[PDB]
Amino acid sequence: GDQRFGDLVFRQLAPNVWQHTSYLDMPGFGAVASNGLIVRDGGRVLVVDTAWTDDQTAQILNWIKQEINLPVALAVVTHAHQDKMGGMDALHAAGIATYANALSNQLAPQEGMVAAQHSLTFAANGWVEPATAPNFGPLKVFYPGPGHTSDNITVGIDGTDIAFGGCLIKDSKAKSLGNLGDADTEHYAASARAFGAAFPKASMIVMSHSAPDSRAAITHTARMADKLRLV
Ligand SMILES: [Zn+2]
Ligand SMILES: [Zn+2]
């Protein structure tokens, strides 16, 4: 089901959801994949996560114009690292409203990222404060606690079986938790568990650095994180 468009790959996940994949192209690194989502919400399109670069993000927008041909109403980015927020300038040049956790926007200058235009804030139970996420349609945004980074957020797609863990969740056969440089090793397992409990009916778990998996991705990630905490 994958389809290559320029240097990107797109895979349809549901009648109105696609995963976008872009690859890092930097002179001393391998071709590291990062996945985000495209959601068609009736007469508009919603994007979760940029690509690694502005030019890759413009190619996502070009695929949307060709294959869907509806305006992109907003994008949500899941934490302040290059794979999720590296293409913010391309979204703003296209007139697309951008949203991120306040804490992602605070961290963005230190991380080399351009901040989103709007800041999301969260209740004590992890759910997004609705007034900060107006007109998000089927996107249900949840902050599960610190894990892969202090700011990482997750997104369920109402009307589908899909929930997106971003860089917090790894697939059920992952050998490690990946990029831990910014990670909260004490709370990571409970944050992975909180993601699972926030979207308890989701059967397709989408994540940044693995292909879509079953809910076993969630329990495997929480186990890896508990091992690491115990070491
Ligand atoms: Zn990251
Ligand atoms: Zn990542």
mmCIF file of all heavy atoms in Angstrom, residues 79-84 148-149 167 170 179 182 209, ligand 1:
data_model
loop_
_atom_site.group_PDB
_atom_site.id
_atom_site.type_symbol
_atom_site.label_atom_id
_atom_site.label_comp_id
_atom_site.label_asym_id
_atom_site.label_seq_id
_atom_site.Cartn_x
_atom_site.Cartn_y
_atom_site.Cartn_z
ATOM 1 N N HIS A 79 5.927 17.434 18.928
ATOM 2 C CA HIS A 79 6.945 17.884 19.889
ATOM 3 C C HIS A 79 8.021 18.657 19.111
ATOM 4 O O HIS A 79 8.044 18.642 17.869
ATOM 5 C CB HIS A 79 7.616 16.754 20.733
ATOM 6 C CG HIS A 79 8.422 15.748 19.946
ATOM 7 N ND1 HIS A 79 7.851 14.705 19.253
ATOM 8 C CD2 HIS A 79 9.762 15.579 19.810
ATOM 9 C CE1 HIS A 79 8.800 13.943 18.734
ATOM 10 N NE2 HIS A 79 9.979 14.478 19.002
ATOM 11 N N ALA A 80 8.904 19.317 19.845
ATOM 12 C CA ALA A 80 9.856 20.253 19.234
ATOM 13 C C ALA A 80 11.144 19.535 18.853
ATOM 14 O O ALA A 80 12.187 19.822 19.438
ATOM 15 C CB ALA A 80 10.104 21.429 20.169
ATOM 16 N N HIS A 81 11.087 18.580 17.932
ATOM 17 C CA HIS A 81 12.250 18.026 17.271
ATOM 18 C C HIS A 81 12.091 18.163 15.765
ATOM 19 O O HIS A 81 10.948 18.364 15.267
ATOM 20 C CB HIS A 81 12.428 16.511 17.597
ATOM 21 C CG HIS A 81 13.010 16.238 18.962
ATOM 22 N ND1 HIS A 81 12.989 14.984 19.557
ATOM 23 C CD2 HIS A 81 13.707 17.045 19.805
ATOM 24 C CE1 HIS A 81 13.618 15.062 20.731
ATOM 25 N NE2 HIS A 81 14.037 16.301 20.914
ATOM 26 N N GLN A 82 13.198 18.025 15.022
ATOM 27 C CA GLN A 82 13.178 18.376 13.607
ATOM 28 C C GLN A 82 12.234 17.549 12.756
ATOM 29 O O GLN A 82 11.652 18.023 11.769
ATOM 30 C CB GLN A 82 14.598 18.336 12.993
ATOM 31 C CG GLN A 82 14.629 18.871 11.586
ATOM 32 C CD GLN A 82 16.009 18.759 10.976
ATOM 33 O OE1 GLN A 82 17.065 18.734 11.670
ATOM 34 N NE2 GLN A 82 16.039 18.621 9.641
ATOM 35 N N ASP A 83 12.052 16.292 13.154
ATOM 36 C CA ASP A 83 11.165 15.419 12.346
ATOM 37 C C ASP A 83 9.699 15.804 12.425
ATOM 38 O O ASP A 83 8.951 15.535 11.458
ATOM 39 C CB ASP A 83 11.331 13.954 12.662
ATOM 40 C CG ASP A 83 11.183 13.603 14.115
ATOM 41 O OD1 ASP A 83 11.273 14.435 15.064
ATOM 42 O OD2 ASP A 83 11.064 12.377 14.389
ATOM 43 N N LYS A 84 9.306 16.530 13.475
ATOM 44 C CA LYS A 84 7.893 16.904 13.662
ATOM 45 C C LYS A 84 7.669 18.373 13.384
ATOM 46 O O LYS A 84 6.509 18.734 13.086
ATOM 47 C CB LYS A 84 7.466 16.638 15.092
ATOM 48 C CG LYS A 84 7.818 15.284 15.648
ATOM 49 C CD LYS A 84 7.007 14.126 15.185
ATOM 50 C CE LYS A 84 7.413 13.550 13.848
ATOM 51 N NZ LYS A 84 6.483 12.517 13.406
ATOM 52 N N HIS A 148 9.211 10.508 25.635
ATOM 53 C CA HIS A 148 10.248 10.703 24.619
ATOM 54 C C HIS A 148 10.834 12.126 24.793
ATOM 55 O O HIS A 148 12.060 12.305 24.728
ATOM 56 C CB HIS A 148 9.603 10.568 23.244
ATOM 57 C CG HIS A 148 10.457 11.049 22.132
ATOM 58 N ND1 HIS A 148 11.525 10.326 21.660
ATOM 59 C CD2 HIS A 148 10.350 12.153 21.352
ATOM 60 C CE1 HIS A 148 12.102 11.015 20.694
ATOM 61 N NE2 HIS A 148 11.421 12.143 20.487
ATOM 62 N N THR A 149 9.972 13.101 25.119
ATOM 63 C CA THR A 149 10.398 14.465 25.478
ATOM 64 C C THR A 149 9.410 14.946 26.526
ATOM 65 O O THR A 149 8.404 14.225 26.842
ATOM 66 C CB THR A 149 10.362 15.478 24.314
ATOM 67 O OG1 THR A 149 9.021 15.483 23.808
ATOM 68 C CG2 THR A 149 11.341 15.097 23.219
ATOM 69 N N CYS A 167 6.529 10.135 18.484
ATOM 70 C CA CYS A 167 7.807 9.478 18.808
ATOM 71 C C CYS A 167 7.802 8.769 20.168
ATOM 72 O O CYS A 167 8.755 8.090 20.570
ATOM 73 C CB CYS A 167 9.024 10.370 18.643
ATOM 74 S SG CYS A 167 9.004 11.210 17.022
ATOM 75 N N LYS A 170 6.975 3.013 20.122
ATOM 76 C CA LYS A 170 7.763 2.251 19.150
ATOM 77 C C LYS A 170 7.035 0.937 18.828
ATOM 78 O O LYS A 170 6.203 0.527 19.643
ATOM 79 C CB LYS A 170 9.186 1.921 19.659
ATOM 80 C CG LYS A 170 10.011 3.072 20.212
ATOM 81 C CD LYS A 170 10.135 4.256 19.291
ATOM 82 C CE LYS A 170 10.788 5.512 19.936
ATOM 83 N NZ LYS A 170 10.567 6.759 19.125
ATOM 84 N N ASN A 179 15.650 7.436 19.973
ATOM 85 C CA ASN A 179 16.234 8.710 20.411
ATOM 86 C C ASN A 179 15.806 9.062 21.836
ATOM 87 O O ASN A 179 14.735 9.668 22.028
ATOM 88 C CB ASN A 179 15.873 9.871 19.479
ATOM 89 C CG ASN A 179 16.610 11.169 19.820
ATOM 90 O OD1 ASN A 179 16.400 12.208 19.173
ATOM 91 N ND2 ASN A 179 17.481 11.118 20.824
ATOM 92 N N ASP A 182 16.501 13.314 25.048
ATOM 93 C CA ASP A 182 15.635 14.317 25.685
ATOM 94 C C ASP A 182 14.592 13.709 26.620
ATOM 95 O O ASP A 182 13.648 14.380 27.090
ATOM 96 C CB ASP A 182 14.952 15.197 24.632
ATOM 97 C CG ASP A 182 15.817 16.318 24.153
ATOM 98 O OD1 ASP A 182 16.905 16.581 24.753
ATOM 99 O OD2 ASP A 182 15.433 16.961 23.164
ATOM 100 N N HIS A 209 8.369 6.364 13.965
ATOM 101 C CA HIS A 209 9.571 5.720 13.464
ATOM 102 C C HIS A 209 9.370 4.216 13.217
ATOM 103 O O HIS A 209 10.351 3.470 13.043
ATOM 104 C CB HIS A 209 10.748 5.992 14.420
ATOM 105 C CG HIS A 209 11.098 7.455 14.525
ATOM 106 N ND1 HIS A 209 11.426 8.217 13.425
ATOM 107 C CD2 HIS A 209 11.034 8.340 15.557
ATOM 108 C CE1 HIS A 209 11.668 9.468 13.773
ATOM 109 N NE2 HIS A 209 11.410 9.585 15.066
HETATM 110 ZN ZN ZN B 1 11.719 13.493 18.996
#
